């Protein structure tokens, strides 16, 4: 079905920013590395727990 | 470090000397100066320090 | 009962090991034997 | 010779401004145990707290009941529900919850824990269903 209003469509230069969701996403289970001092999980995805 | 100045006579107040000085303070003086009986100055000098549990110094603070 | 260490138990129990989980499981009953996340 | 990992010396500047005599007996020094308390339950007609459960109290009752049904499970409910949370919620709604709510009004210096005991089975329930 056609839209009742004409739509502004045209070529626009777009840039893919290097913020990948596959690198930013993180999910951890109830286990993993813990700090020897506090016993708390380590910090962030890089340490594989936290 | 504490220094004892007796009109120019300079002598170092060592922790042993300080403990000797503080051990002569009565609890009456401690109370009348607004301090608790658990805050006697004799506790300010330590001949036996506490090495903390290894739980707070995992394998630097042990150096 | 021998008061063995966790590492000693993990080494000795590495005969029932089957097959990030960080845990070994029994080859017979699939029970958690021990865990190995990092060696200190 | 160049060290990069400095520790950033830390400074506190605002000073606080909080506003016979024998060595020590076995009473003034010590006795950290704190004397035991007796439970002074306010009579039901002298209670001043609300006869309606707060959402905090109802939520805590449901959570406690559901956690207990996790290990137990002998239930007085008629209809069968497949989760302890639903069972506890229906127990609260059907006024069959086996718990009581104690509201500690005051702890007296003499060693009395003045409390109001409220029965959730005669109380107003604010939860949704
Ligand atoms: Zn097994």
List keywords for this structure.
part of a larger assembly, 4 chains, A: 50 residues, little secondary structure, 8% helix, elongated, D: 129 residues, alpha+beta, three-stranded mixed beta sheet, 2 helices, 3 strands, 21% helix, binds zinc ion, M1249L (chain C), DNA-directed RNA polymerase subunit (chain B), DNA-directed RNA polymerase subunit beta (chain A)
Overall shape of chain B: it is flat
Helix/strand structural class of chain B: alpha+beta
Shape of chain D: extended
N/C terminus separation of chain B: 24 Å
Q: Roughly what fraction of the amino acids of chain D lie in strands? A: 5-15%
What is the subunit organization of this protein?
part of a larger assembly
Q: How helical, in percent, are the residues of chain D?
A: 10-25%
Please give the count of helices of chain D. 2
Most extensive contact: A-C, 6 and 8 residues
Number of helices of chain B: 2
Derived structural class of chain D: alpha+beta
Largest sheet features of chain D:
3 strands, mixed
**Helices and strands of chain D, in N-to-C order?**
EHHEE
Strand line-up across the major sheet of chain B: 1-2
GO molecular function (chain D): DNA binding; DNA-directed RNA polymerase activity
GO cellular component, one term (chain D): DNA-directed RNA polymerase complex
GO biological process, one term (chain D): transcription by RNA polymerase II
Keywords (chain D): DNA-directed RNA polymerase, Transcription
